[PDB]
Amino acid sequence: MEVIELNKCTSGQSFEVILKPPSDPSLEEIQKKLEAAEERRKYQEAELLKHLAE
């Protein structure tokens, strides 16, 4: 039941009680992904307009 690191101030306090011891992707990559998805949307719309034109 060891109490360690007791710290007190006017606002309150804190401490630790131990019961038992032990035993990334670049901005450009993001742009690439967003643009790829946009390109796929554009292609799908292009195919639709092509179908409608027929």
């Binding site: 710290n7 309150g12 630790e16 019961l19």
Partner: protein
Amino acid sequence: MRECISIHVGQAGVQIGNACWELYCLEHGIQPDGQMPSDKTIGGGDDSFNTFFSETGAGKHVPRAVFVDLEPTVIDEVRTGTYRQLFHPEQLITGKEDAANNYARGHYTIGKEIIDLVLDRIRKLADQCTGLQGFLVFHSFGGGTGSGFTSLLMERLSVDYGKKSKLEFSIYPAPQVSTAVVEPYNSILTTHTTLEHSDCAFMVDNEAIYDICRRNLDIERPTYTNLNRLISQIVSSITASLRFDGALNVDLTEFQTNLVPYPRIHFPLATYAPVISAEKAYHEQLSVAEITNACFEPANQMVKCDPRHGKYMACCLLYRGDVVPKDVNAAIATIKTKRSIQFVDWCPTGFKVGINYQPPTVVPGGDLAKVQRAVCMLSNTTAIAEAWARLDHKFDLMYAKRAFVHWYVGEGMEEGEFSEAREDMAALEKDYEEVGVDS
């Protein structure tokens, strides 16, 4: 003093944000006006509350916060509401049409068009920081914006602010208040892309809050308002250490250090007590031992799960009000003999305790009773993986038939992202299982 910027994304993030900043103002004695009489330092200072509030030369205390939503109607209310003078327009960002409960629409289609403005407005707040420690991000899992745009935002933040910590407050979907069938999809998709970018995430299951409001506040059919006032109390308990003088969880890095040993396993279970109805006339005030024992009741948890069948990696007890260390130690000693509290072998069986003497503040006319002492326990237990299991099962049911999938592919997302996100989740359940179980 090291500043914290709060980001509120989508309807759920914005509405919860409203509730939190209202409560913050009450706790620090800040008027809706923005004036803070008790603050004798005009136009600046290095006080603990300055971590969340900046100051103008006219004595207005301005929240270090950004509200973002892809449609305007929710943020519009902030603009025309009680605390409208608190924020200035640059902090409130709105689009024209929302993500329609579609992660792909929020992340790829609409997100691409608004991401640079959002980051710029964030950069402006950061520019006024002598020592920014990081960000607190509020969002739902199930919404198109809350899921899709948030994960995009988190990626860019890791790029623009590589050193800074990022904490999440996330709303886990629940059918009793859910607005979309595809929420499990959005939940898994956003968790996958956000995972490596978040240092510590506090999941709040709407089902748990809903049941707590019915059970303990006697509310027949809880509204978002009821839910958010309870949620903000939890959030306040968690962020109090950043807004007040103290020695525990004093910076965002400490949250990770104290609660997150393994990076991927960064989802602490929050448990709060007591929750007492403001309508009850004769109420008996619970002791330290009672509110502490209640922290180990599944009914009081923000996520319904059984910690008995899991392992603890860390445990933090955050008290507010009439509490002395002697009574906490007595309570913990008794509880340890009557509860199944097993830690992993490579961790000390212990508790980090923080006490703030100021009892919880409640919104006047709210549903919550003023109490003399309250506690929020933050424990990293493998039992919270139950929530991932539930979510992953719903995902599997729909995805096996490719139900609703065309909505996402139609926005430019590839079907493979579904599988890639699901596999990452399977690895996550596996990670928890290794840590929490022995063969």
